[PDB]
Every structure is written in structure tokens, then in C-alpha cells.
């Protein structure tokens with residue numbers, strides 16, 4: 001029993017974090033096979049950040065201007081290129097600790113673990129979700145740039161996020177590992193609006209299922225509702241519309257608890273309409289939306305990795 | 307910027323989790339040097355759990371009745387003993403992945419990371435606190451027994467917790483690595499009350515400091531208060547009494563933010579007396595108490611490990 005926001009074990013990703021330096025700027029890179037991946041703004045000064053011509057800036061640099069350090073072991077750069085907003089530094093040695101990996105672009109609402117690093121050394125790990133407006137609400141200080149987000153599927157690490165910037169909100173923006181930003185953001189120190197965020201409705205329902213499984217069932221009400229009537233409530237409350245796809249993925253949770261999806265929708269409707277009267281659900285006084293239906297299944301299934 | 311409940315990177319502890327089997331019962335053990343540590347109730351059946359005579363039960367067992375598996379590598383048990391509520395199995399090979407480690411008994415209010423495992427394979431990682439009533443509110447299913455809690459100080463892993471049981475609350479109880487329970491609990495399937503829990507006041511203040519650092523300052527009020535007057539409010543609200551020791555440890559936070567400890571005490575007093583009016587602090591509608599003053603300093607300092 002019990003429900004906790006749980007991150008993947010970070011061992012396989014720790015053995016891939018290196019420190020990349022170019023000029024005075026130092027940040028974290030990801031070392032897989034004989035390639036090091038890091039934010040391309042490692043090549044910028046503080047002044048360059050206001051309006052960088054990245055192709056121009058990169059031309060001034062050669063292989064030896066890039067210092068890659070792995071702990072204290074240290075790598076020879078023999079090729080460099082820019083893929084969108086990441087740089088790829090070709091080094092002379094494969095990472096002997098390269099896990100089975102792949103690069104994936106995740107979708108809004110999906111969750112992932114973040115290993116926050118500084119100077120190429122891991123600091124801590126926490127779990128979060130790609131918000132529908134393609135930001136994440138993380139914990140990132142100066143030098144955490146290049147820290148990565150990932151999921152683990154038994155032995156295979158799916159890298160999905162690399163940290164690039166903080167916005168004027170304290171929210172965070174970043175790219176996949178092909179260097180394509182999530183969201184409309186660019187890697188420039190110029191005012192950028194995230195846009196209206198919305199609540200991940202299918203994740204809220206999954207959490208509400210997780211609550212029922214763990215004994216907390218006071219919100220379980222008398223009522224039911226329709227998909228369209230519930231959706232009509234979701235949008236006054238800035239919730240993402242619920243589709244039949246969302247119903248289907250909550251199916252397993254529906255059948256383990258014996259509660260139809262639409263009856264949970266109605267319970268969630270009165271919660272949106274009436275508040276919590278200062279009660280809590282799984283130790284929270286807010287409706288929690290960074291658990292996917294798979295995060296719930298996996299936590300009350302006990303799935304392991306290595 | 308940003309504030310997240312962050313766990314230590316689990317890499318050093320992953321390389322120590324093994325699977326221990328005795329009879330039909332299987333659980334997790336911790337393999338350091340040539341010794342494997344695990345809950346002594348691995349030696350019990352389901353019926354034994356109601357009232358176990360552990361010394362008697364252990365006499366029926368020999369070295370070869372204990373199957374230790376590390377991934378698929380596999381260990382030869384050449385000695386076994388019972389230290390309080392842990393068994394120690396002497397194996398024929400040192401763990402080549404033994405980190406610099408030590409065993410520590412932590413105090414109520416301190417925090418630690420938990421690596422939840424099943425069958426000796428890590429499943430996920432999350433952070434928590436030893437509640438003042440010596441329970442933890444974790445996420446533990448059948449077979450997670452023997453999963454450990456730890457802190458990391460640069461390169462040194464301080465193991466402080468091993469999971470043994472769930473109580474009739476869904477809260478969790480366990481031992482240090484010398485096998486001494488935290489709390490008044492015994493390893494028997496007999497009704498056991500945790501006792502009244504209280505809120506870790508010095509941790510709440512630290513979080514409130516963390517909030518100020520991250521821009522959230524609406525609760526910062528006009529008032530101040532005295533240690534004794536605040537304490538008189540803390541105990542109607544089941545808060546732990548605040549000592550001058552607690553003031554001193556909040557000192558660094560006091561000086562980085564320029565807010566006297568007693569003025570935060572008064573802000574926290576009206577929060578206890580008046581609620582949050584449905585507002586939030588660092589994305590929570592509850593007063594958060596599983597961040598120590600060091601967890602705060604370390605997260606807005608960017609301390610790394612390896």
C-alpha cells in the first residue's frame with residue numbers, strides 16, 4: 001500500500017552524465033556510444049544569449065575548444081555538429097557504461113524522471129510531466145542545463161528531454177534529444193510566453209483510481225455523467241477534454257476497482273464544482289495530475305527494472 | 307528556480323540490491339563487502355508471522371537454505387547470523403560494486419531516499435521523512451521488504467532504513483541496518499498502533515523559506531511572535547515544539563532571505579489559525595513538512611554527488 005510520486009532508478013543515466021566546457025560556460029552533456037549530446041548554447045557567452053547567430057557562433061569553434069570531462073576521465077573530441085538545438089561532439093572512446101537506449105519525443109501529459117546535474121555530477125532525481133503547454137515545472141539552477149529526462153522499460157532507457165532554459169515563470173523548457181524544442185520556445189534570452197496551461201484530466205482520473213485502491217474513497221459519489229456533460233465542465237475548469245481514447249486507457253483501472261469511468265468522471269465533477277472542503281486525497285489538498293494511468297498500474301503492480 | 311521533492315541519485319544503491327530467498331519467501335537484501343543484510347522474517351512462512359519464535363525458527367535453517375541472487379550472478383552463503391531484526395548472510399565474494407558506505411540511525415524529522423525493489427531489482431526512488439512517531443508514509447507492495455533508505459554525502463552512502471512492515475494505516479515501519487526498529491514496533495503480524503503523529507515544525511519553516519526564495523511570498527505577514535507564544539499555538543495544531551536549536555539551524559535560511567525566524571513563525575501562526583483560503587504555496591494546498599533545512603539549502607545550492 002501507499003502512493004508516492006516515484007522516479008525511475010537513475011543508475012543507468014548517472015553513468016552517462018559528463019561535464020562539457022566551451023570558453024567559460026560549463027554544463028552537462030549526455031555521453032552515449034562515442035557521441036556527447038548537450039545544449040548548443042554551451043557555445044555562448046552571457047552577451048551572446050540576447051540574440052545568438054548559432055551557425056556563426058559555432059564556426060568560431062574547433063574540436064579542441066570543447067572540453068568534455070567524465071568524472072576525471074577525459075575525452076578527445078574528434079568531430080562536432082549542430083542538430084537543431086543540441087550539439088553532438090564525436091569523441092574518441094565509447095562510453096563503456098552506455099545502457100541500451102533510444103531517443104523518444106514524448107507527448108503532453110506523459111511523465112518522465114529528471115536527473116538534475118551540475119558540472120556533470122548528478123545531484124538528485126524527481127518525477128514530472130510534460131505539461132499540455134509543453135513546459136515542465138522542475139528544479140533547475142545555473143549549470144543544470146543539459147540534465148536529461150528519461151523513462152526506463154526494463155533494461156532500455158528512453159531519453160526524452162534535455163534541459164535548456166527557465167522561462168519568466170520559473171517553469172522550464174527543453175528539447176528532445178534530437179534538439180527540437182518541446183513547445184514554441186527558442187534558445188534565446190528574449191521574452192517568451194508559455195501560454196495557458198490546462199489540467200491533464202486523464203491523469204487526474206488515474207490518480208483518483210489510485211486513491212480508491214489505497215482505501216481513500218470519500219469522493220466516490222452517487223452520481224454518473226456523460227462524456228459530453230463532463231467535458232462541458234472540464235473546460236470551465238481549464239481541464240483537457242476527455243476522449244474515448246482516455247476512457248480506454250483507464251479501462252484496466254476501471255476493471256481492477258469495479259468503478260465505471262463515467263462514474264469517476266461524475267465524482268470528479270462535484271470535486272471541481274464543490275472543492276475538497278479542506279479534505280485530502282492521498283495526502284494532497286489539490287487534484288493531482290502528474291500520474292499517468294501507466295504510472296498508477298506500474299506502482300500497484302510492482303514493476304522492476306535493470 | 308523551482309522546488310521539487312528530490313531523491314538522491316540511486317546508482318550507488320542499485321548495485322547493492324540482491325534477491326534473498328528462504329523456503330517460499332523471497333525479498334530484497336543489501337550486499338556490502340561479503341555480507342548480505344535483509345529482514346529476518348525472510349525465514350518465516352505466512353503462518354509463522356502471527357507469533358514467530360525467531361531464534362527457534364532460525365535454528366531449523368542452514369547456510370544452504372538461503373538463496374542469494376544478484377541479477378543472475380549468484381552467491382555462496384558461508385555464514386549466517388541474526389542481529390536484532392536483520393539477518394546477515396556471509397557470502398564468499400565481496401560486492402565489487404560496494405560504495406563507500408556507513409550505517410546510521412537517523413532521528414525523527416530527518417529525510418532520506420528510498421529505493422523500492424522487488425525480487426532484488428530496483429523499481430523506483432522517492433524521498434521521505436522519518437515521522438516523529440517513527441513511521442514513514444511510503445509506497446511498499448508485497449516483496450518490497452528489505453528495500454533500503456539512504457542519504458548520500460558526496461561519495462559516501464549512509465544507509466539508515468530497511469523496510470520490514472506495513473501497519474494497519476498503510477504507513478510503514480522498519481529498522482536501521484543494525485536491525486533495531488524505529489519506533490515501538492516488532493516484526494510480528496499482531497495489531498500495532500503507531501501513536502499520534504505530529505508535524506515537523508522546523509521542516510515547515512524551512513519549506514516556507516524555500517517558498518520565499520522561489521518568489522512565493524504572499525503569506526509573509528506584518529506580525530512577529532515569541533518562541534513561547536508560537537509554541538503555544540504549535541501544540542493545539544499538533545506541531546512539534548520549536549527549540550532554539552531549530553532556530554539556529556534555520557539561521558542560514560534566515561540570513562539568505564533577510565527574514566528573522568520569529569517573523570516566519572508568526573506568518574506560520576496565521577496560516578495555522580486561518581488556513582490558506584484555497585491558495586497554494588510552492589504548488590501545494592497543504593503545509594509541507596518533509597524538507598529539512600539542509601534539503602532546502604542543498605537544493606538552492608546545487609550540491610552534487612558521486
Ligand SMILES: *[C@H](O)[C@H](C[C@@H]1CCNC1=O)NC(=O)[C@H](CC(C)C)NC(=O)[C@@H](NC(=O)OCc1ccccc1)[C@@H](C)OC(C)(C)C
Nearest residue numbers: 041140141142143144145164165166168187188189190191
Ligand atoms: C543553463 O545551465 C541555464 C539553466 C537555467 C538558469 C538557471 N535555471 C535554469 O533553468 N540556462 C540558460 O542560461 C538558458 C539558455 C537559453 C539558450 C535556453 N537561458 C535561460 O534559462 C534564461 N531563459 C530565458 O531567457 O527565457 C526567455 C526569457 C524569459 C524571461 C525574460 C527574458 C527572456 C534564464 C537565464 O532567464 C531567466 C531565468 C528568465 C533570468
Ligand SMILES: *[C@H](O)[C@H](C[C@@H]1CCNC1=O)NC(=O)[C@H](CC(C)C)NC(=O)[C@@H](NC(=O)OCc1ccccc1)[C@@H](C)OC(C)(C)C
Nearest residue numbers: 347446447448449450451470471472474493494495496497
Ligand atoms: C514483506 O515484503 C512485506 C511488505 C509489506 C507487505 C505489503 N506491503 C508491505 O509493506 N512485509 C511483511 O509481510 C511484514 C512482515 C513483518 C515481520 C514485519 N508484515 C507486514 O507488513 C504486515 N504488518 C503487520 O502485520 O503489522 C502489525 C499488524 C497490523 C495490522 C493488523 C495486524 C497486525 C502486513 C502484511 O499486514 C497488513 C499489511 C496489515 C495486512
